[PDB]
């Protein structure tokens, strides 16, 4: 059994975003919209339900850990359910949470060379936190092969490079390298059950589709409904293809991609505050439900029993 | 009228702390303790109730802004009540929140030379955030004289250096300079009402006591009840005098200091998760109340009408 816990399901900024008064964020505050608040994307994995692996550490991490009981087993005066942390990129929304975990250092952190470089230069988390009882102990994620964290020995992670979208602070935002962004394939080596996790998805080729058909659950990018969604809300100028996000609707959309996977469980995660799928009375939400696609939410439990 | 809003009232780690199972943190989780959860220290100031000045930006800033309506006036699709931010030090618990405000850059940030140096080197917030539409616009806080932020033109800030307790990540944690830590004197130039804000207080001399008697409200360090509180809870080895905190109880304690101020309003803020004053049925809470001292809490409103 693989326990998957959605701690956060919103894109950077959360929902509602602190400075946004779009139809969703204002509709939530005014109470004229059936929607649920969401923290920034983060999931937790376990093979036993006691030892947990954190995938990305959001700025909302303190609230995310409180809301989930197994994170505090109370086995000692100082304790936590987090046994390791895996980083998919060096983005602010996925790494800032590490600052809030300074009291429980050291931590085993799994990231790539490129992420480790960003987190030792532009955003030197590894250098800052080292002053807290050991800090972050880096475990390299090589772009090939697989890795197993000793706390969840039945979990097999097989990373794959996705199209690079390096953070703005990054020394090489203008010079993208493989290793800037990862999608994860987690396998329960007891059952063969596979999870395809890719909150940041901006390009999908035929070799990516190949391994997706070997998965049982697809947990992927759901940031935007339209590529120009930020303009249609009048809160931004950036498009999904600029930010490296494949929108649900349109040609080469996620809904077009996911349509070739009728046998897999399909969940949209990392959802921006402007996305109408957050509105449960929205026709967009209807089309998503109609296609057998779920909209992740804070507190969602995904249990992986077996392979099909 | 000076509007003072306590966004956060806990010391670093908040209450309860994510990894702590002391008598307070566990007593809260078990429901066997009458106490209220608290976010990390942060207050907001205003002279009109519309334009707000943020004093320190905690990691819990997203929740702190949500809980307080005037932070989102909804005057445009993109808006906020924060017009300026003042930093008292370069500590993680007071600066990390700036990362969560990246969507609404630029911001006018008020800090000292030494804080600006820490926030451009060890924790380069000013360098990172500049990639977000201008980033942080530094306004120097000189260690003498006063300053007025144009958004609250009736508020007069007069900073004073306190005993230096530079952060662990800081290049000069071993080489303390004046300007590492500030206490603030805010004056309503319409009424003469003065606020003495000093969440980090580890030493008090006769010249500090002098200006305290010119204040109407004392908003000061309430981190520990005893200097060896971390040892008595069995969760730490550090003492208050090591961390630069004057404990309430004992010789040279805050309660001993505050005893010479029977005419001022007295509020304890920046309170650690191990402090028994968080327990409302505690004899420590009783002694604090008996002396006319209040225990700050998240959501507390302090209104300064006049001078006495
Ligand atoms: Mg993001
Ligand atoms: Mg602190
Ligand atoms: Zn919005
Ligand atoms: Zn505690």
From Swiss-Prot, chains A, B:
Q: Name one Pfam family in it.
A: Lactamase_B_2
Keyword RNA-binding among record annotations: no
InterPro entries on file:
Metallo-B-lactamas, PQQ_synth_PqqB, RibonucZ/Hydroxyglut_hydro
UniProt keyword annotation of Zinc present: no
Gene3D superfamilies reported in the protein's UniProt record: Ribonuclease Z/Hydroxyacylglutathione hydrolase-like
Provide the coiled-coil residue spans: none
Q: Name one GO biological process term.
A: pyrroloquinoline quinone biosynthetic process
Which pathway does the UniProt entry assign to this protein? Cofactor biosynthesis; pyrroloquinoline quinone biosynthesis
Domain of life, per lineage: Bacteria
**Which keywords does this chain's UniProt record carry?**
PQQ biosynthesis, Transport
Q: What does this protein do?
A: May be involved in the transport of PQQ or its precursor to the periplasm.
Q: Which family is it part of?
A: Belongs to the PqqB family.
The name under which this protein is listed is: Coenzyme PQQ synthesis protein B
Species of the source? Pseudomonas putida (strain ATCC 47054 / DSM 6125 / CFBP 8728 / NCIMB 11950 / KT2440)
Taxonomy-wise, where does this protein's organism fall, top ranks first? Bacteria, Pseudomonadati, Pseudomonadota, Gammaproteobacteria, Pseudomonadales
């Amino acid at each position: 059994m693989m326990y998957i816990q959605v701690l956060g399901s919103a894109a950077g900024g959360g929902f509602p975003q602190w400075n946004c008064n779009c139809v969703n964020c204002k509709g939530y505050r005014d109470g004229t919209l059936k929607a649920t608040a969401r923290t920034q994307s983060s999931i937790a994995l376990s093979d036993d339900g006691v030892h947990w692996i954190l995938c990305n550490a959001s700025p909302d991490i303190r609230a995310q850990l409180q809301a989930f009981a197994p994170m505090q087993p109370a086995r000692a005066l100082r304790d936590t359910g987090i046994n390791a942390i895996v980083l998919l990129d060096s983005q602010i929304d996925h790494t800032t949470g590490l600052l809030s975990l300074r009291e429980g250092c050291p931590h085993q952190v799994w990231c790539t060379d490129m992420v480790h470089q960003d987190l030792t230069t532009g955003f030197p988390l590894f250098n800052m936190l080292s002053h807290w009882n050991g800090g972050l102990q880096w475990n390299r994620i090589e772009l090939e092969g697989s890795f197993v964290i000793d706390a969840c020995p039945n979990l097999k992670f097989t990373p794959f490079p996705l199209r690079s979208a390096a953070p703005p602070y990054s020394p090489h935002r203008f010079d993208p390298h493989p290793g800037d962004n990862l999608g994860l394939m987690v396998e329960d080596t007891r059952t063969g059950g596979k999870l395809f996790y890719a909150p940041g998805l901006g390009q999908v080729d035929e070799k990516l589709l190949a391994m997706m058909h070997g998965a049982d659950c697809l947990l992927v990018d759901g940031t935007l409904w339209e590529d120009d969604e930020m303009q249609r809300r009048g809160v931004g100028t950036r498009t999904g293809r600029e930010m490296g996000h494949l929108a649900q609707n349109g040609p080469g959309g996620t809904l077009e991609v996911l349509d070739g996977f009728p046998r897999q469980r399909k969940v949209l995660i990392h959802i921006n505050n402007t996305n109408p799928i957050l509105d449960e009375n929205s026709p967009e939400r209807a089309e998503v439900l109609r296609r057998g696609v779920e909209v992740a939410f804070d507190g969602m439990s995904i249990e992986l029993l077996e392979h099909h």
